[PDB]
Amino acid sequence: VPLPQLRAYTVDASWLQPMAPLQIADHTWQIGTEDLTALLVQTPDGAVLLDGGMPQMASHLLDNMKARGVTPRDLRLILLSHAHACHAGPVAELKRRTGAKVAANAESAVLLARGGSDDLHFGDGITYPPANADRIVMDGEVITVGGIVFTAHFMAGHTPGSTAWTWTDTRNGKPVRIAYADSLSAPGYQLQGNPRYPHLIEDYRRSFATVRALPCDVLLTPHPGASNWDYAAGARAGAKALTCKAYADAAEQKFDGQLAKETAG
Amino acid sequence: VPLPQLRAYTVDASWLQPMAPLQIADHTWQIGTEDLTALLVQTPDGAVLLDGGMPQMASHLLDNMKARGVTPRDLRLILLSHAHACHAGPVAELKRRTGAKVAANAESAVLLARGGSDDLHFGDGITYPPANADRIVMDGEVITVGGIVFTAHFMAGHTPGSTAWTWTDTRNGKPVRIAYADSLSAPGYQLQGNPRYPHLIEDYRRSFATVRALPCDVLLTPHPGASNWDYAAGARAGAKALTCKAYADAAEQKFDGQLAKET
Amino acid sequence: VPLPQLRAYTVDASWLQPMAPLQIADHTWQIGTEDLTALLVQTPDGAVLLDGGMPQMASHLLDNMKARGVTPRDLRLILLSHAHACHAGPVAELKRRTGAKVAANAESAVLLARGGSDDLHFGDGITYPPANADRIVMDGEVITVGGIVFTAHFMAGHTPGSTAWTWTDTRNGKPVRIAYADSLSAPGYQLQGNPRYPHLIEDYRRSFATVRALPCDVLLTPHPGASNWDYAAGARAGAKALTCKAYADAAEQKFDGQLAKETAG
Amino acid sequence: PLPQLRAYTVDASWLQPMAPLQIADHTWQIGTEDLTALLVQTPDGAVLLDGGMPQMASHLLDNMKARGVTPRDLRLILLSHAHACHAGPVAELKRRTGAKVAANAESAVLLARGGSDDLHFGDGITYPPANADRIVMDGEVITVGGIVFTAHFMAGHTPGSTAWTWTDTRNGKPVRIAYADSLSAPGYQLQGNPRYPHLIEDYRRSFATVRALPCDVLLTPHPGASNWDYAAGARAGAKALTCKAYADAAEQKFDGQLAKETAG
Numbered sequence A, C: 001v002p003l004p005q006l007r008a009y010t011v012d013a014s015w016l017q018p019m020a021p022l023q024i025a026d027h028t029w030q031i032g033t034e035d036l037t038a039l040l041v042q043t044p045d046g047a048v049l050l051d052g053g054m055p056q057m058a059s060h061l062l063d064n065m066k067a068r069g070v071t072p073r074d075l076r077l078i079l080l081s082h083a084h085a086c087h088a089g090p091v092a093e094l095k096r097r098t099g100a101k102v103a104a105n106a107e108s109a110v111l112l113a114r115g116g117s118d119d120l121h122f123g124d125g126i127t128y129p130p131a132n133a134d135r136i137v138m139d140g141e142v143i144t145v146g147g148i149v150f151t152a153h154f155m156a157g158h159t160p161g162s163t164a165w166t167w168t169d170t171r172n173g174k175p176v177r178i179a180y181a182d183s184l185s186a187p188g189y190q191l192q193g194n195p196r197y198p199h200l201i202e203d204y205r206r207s208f209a210t211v212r213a214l215p216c217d218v219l220l221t222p223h224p225g226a227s228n229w230d231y232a233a234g235a236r237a238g239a240k241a242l243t244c245k246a247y248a249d250a251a252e253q254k255f256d257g258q259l260a261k262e263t264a265g
Numbered sequence B: 001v002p003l004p005q006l007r008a009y010t011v012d013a014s015w016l017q018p019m020a021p022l023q024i025a026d027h028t029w030q031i032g033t034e035d036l037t038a039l040l041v042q043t044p045d046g047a048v049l050l051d052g053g054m055p056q057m058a059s060h061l062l063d064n065m066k067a068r069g070v071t072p073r074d075l076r077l078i079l080l081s082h083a084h085a086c087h088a089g090p091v092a093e094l095k096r097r098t099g100a101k102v103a104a105n106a107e108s109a110v111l112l113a114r115g116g117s118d119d120l121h122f123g124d125g126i127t128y129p130p131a132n133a134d135r136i137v138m139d140g141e142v143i144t145v146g147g148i149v150f151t152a153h154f155m156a157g158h159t160p161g162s163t164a165w166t167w168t169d170t171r172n173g174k175p176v177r178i179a180y181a182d183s184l185s186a187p188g189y190q191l192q193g194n195p196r197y198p199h200l201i202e203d204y205r206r207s208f209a210t211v212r213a214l215p216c217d218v219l220l221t222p223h224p225g226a227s228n229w230d231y232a233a234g235a236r237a238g239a240k241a242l243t244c245k246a247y248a249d250a251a252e253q254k255f256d257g258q259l260a261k262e263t
Numbered sequence D: 001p002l003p004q005l006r007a008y009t010v011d012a013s014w015l016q017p018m019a020p021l022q023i024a025d026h027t028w029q030i031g032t033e034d035l036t037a038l039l040v041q042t043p044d045g046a047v048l049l050d051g052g053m054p055q056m057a058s059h060l061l062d063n064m065k066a067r068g069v070t071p072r073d074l075r076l077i078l079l080s081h082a083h084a085c086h087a088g089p090v091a092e093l094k095r096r097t098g099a100k101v102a103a104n105a106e107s108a109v110l111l112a113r114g115g116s117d118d119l120h121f122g123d124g125i126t127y128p129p130a131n132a133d134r135i136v137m138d139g140e141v142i143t144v145g146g147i148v149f150t151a152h153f154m155a156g157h158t159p160g161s162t163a164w165t166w167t168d169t170r171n172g173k174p175v176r177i178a179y180a181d182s183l184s185a186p187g188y189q190l191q192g193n194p195r196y197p198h199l200i201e202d203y204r205r206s207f208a209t210v211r212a213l214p215c216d217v218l219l220t221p222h223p224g225a226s227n228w229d230y231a232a233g234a235r236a237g238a239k240a241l242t243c244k245a246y247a248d249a250a251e252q253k254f255d256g257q258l259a260k261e262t263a264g
Ligand SMILES: [Mg+2]
Pocket: none
């Protein structure tokens, strides 16, 4: 009886299906894959990347940036929703290949630095190349790049360091408040009496409320399907996109269902 | 004109006056200096150290451990109230010289790893040797060593990673609920509109309430004066020590006055 | 066509075949798998582990330690030949589950801390959970545990941080000088004009000489086949083992052939 | 009673700000009168080799501004060795600029612990820790614009001590600049040092390495070691040592120290 072979983080093909840049607002573009969000915000003072998707997505991201007129040197900042392999995957490589520095909260920083290992729920099941944060941010802290202001909103649950980022762009000669809210799922998590996360339920409850109150004209999520985006649909990608309020409400209802099932017995 | 010389974190003499171990309960001892707390909890499964004081206290702590019958190998765990120089100072050296591993929350861990540099309020004024945390703890998480159970209570404010640790020891044939609550001070802090700590006020207010509600037969604090301990007085050191409620009340009062003067 | 799926570090079944502790000398035991070395060296003051094999080997190592009378508290030190996945794999987990601290040279420490990512030759193909070194060692430095003294001998090549560890144990009332020499292979490596490792050839050449000159009654290697050990043969496991000289000479030959092939190509 | 914490107090000249002093077409001394901090500026970004003391961060930034180098323009930080008097402001510079650090493994580990647990100084000279972004190997090259930097390991003063070499121009001719690290062993236990068993061997190799460097112009982290006088402006390098003279002087001093140690 040999030990099991290691398994890589294999995923649905659509998570790895490359797409051309899709314009969300005047300065904001979806540059990831059909089923994983990676947002490029272009400012007069360099570019900002929010999430990168999977580890093998680095070169694709760089190719899309080039199409947008962004050189590796132009990329100044990487922000993250949470430090799982399907969102922070290519961060280490992007840091080696670009001028980009990472800003994240302490919880996301520590998970990123250990490459997603010793996950509270997944253990070492979903690892990726580790990276160091260049700046630690606090809840409500702002970062300004080229007159565009990004605000962090902590929403602990999916991971302890789960974060929503908000900024104001423009579209059709009008300000548009963009909310990139993190995942609110608890996929296979032990919810009550979890020794690794004693206040998990309380944190999720606060996070549902936080997501509801976000400045949110346009909502996007790390997994686009969670906010009902269809990136493959092009110009009508966000035709049926959920609001922050509807997103949180659906998430809490799922959560409540899971909590009920767990209580038996 | 030459740039100013660097300035060291210079402290009151009493913070640097060694003392012999002072018994708090059957397994819990104050082993730091007269004016800085360092708590040794001795179990049949090894020893736990809560805070180490200043960087220069490492050898003294080891002297006191040996006096208590705890070898460098016997020290298993280091816990921290917060990662300032006056409490986490000797952690790196203790890690090199003992079997000890550090458990801390993410905020304390990142501050520890940068040796207290780029402090939200103090800049680089209070640096110390950096150290890596061996285990990251979440709010309410328990750590059991030799049948003694330590519980973490996050109380953000003084630092983002400020933590209270509680455990039950025995004294006089009865259980004693010990609370090692962190500093609730905001010394010279900008409280409102602080870009480095936007929700400082909310965190402090939650922390006052957390401390007030702690399981707390005996309160100890990293700076013993904050809870009215006098370690140099020996047997009557904690005779007039504050309750957790009194400690939080005084802290909130001081905070409220500071906030009023700022607005 | 989507981006390629991630590929796991899959290995020969024999690398993952657990074995019971095999005694090498009075205080030195092989406790890994049939085809990956993990050495337990015991003293009255605690135990040392030299290498752990693959990431999935953690629980097996702990079980074998238990069988040898080494509790998690008794494991004091982890040393490494080199920080590849097939030798440092379970180090992070062992640190979490035991009192063990890691001592390694700066090169090995930096590779361990990035979990084998950005490997000079393998890129991100062989990643594992990252870990921090607790102590940095210099060439020729000794570490004493109980009455046993371990000496580091730097032998850069296979990795920049490649190290041989030597100590003296006993067998049949007599001292036995054990040499745990690191790998001297260059599997698929670009040898000449490698921008990531300009002095690769020079380092290997000095390393062949270093291995040749080690205090060496008993040679052991991270991959037992390299020193002609057969861990499945029990009492006769080391009956056909190579000397340090023979091991270095064969490795230099192989290397010379590889260099000639590269030069021709 | 226990002693107070120590601050790294230094000679006034080490903290004496100076305006940028041109060494060659791309290369400027931008530190203080008695601590080297070299700025190399290209159309594809600037490189800083050493920063001096921790309190020098704002001064370096002011001098960069004077040279037309914005915080965003600063791409790379290289180090001679990771002591407080050279890597001091690195953490702050990383926070305030786009700069990333390239260093060898030895320098990276020392930098990450802010100079603490020094092989010889213990915790006597500490500074704010920083992480390296790129690990370099011996002989590795880094290209920024038209400038090519080559690393030459010269272990001794610290395990990670490195010389950096590049070719600039001066009056229509190539000038091979060698920024050689310290070859001093101040108060060091040389023989039988358990923390550095092969110290003597490494130093002797390092003297030879420095002697052989491509070296039209030598600069050193402590400029006095190579007989530079930065305060003298246009005359600063008029009596600068060759790489050979620098290495020879260092070896003679080292030999003297070893003799004294063996005798005592
Ligand atoms: Mg026992």
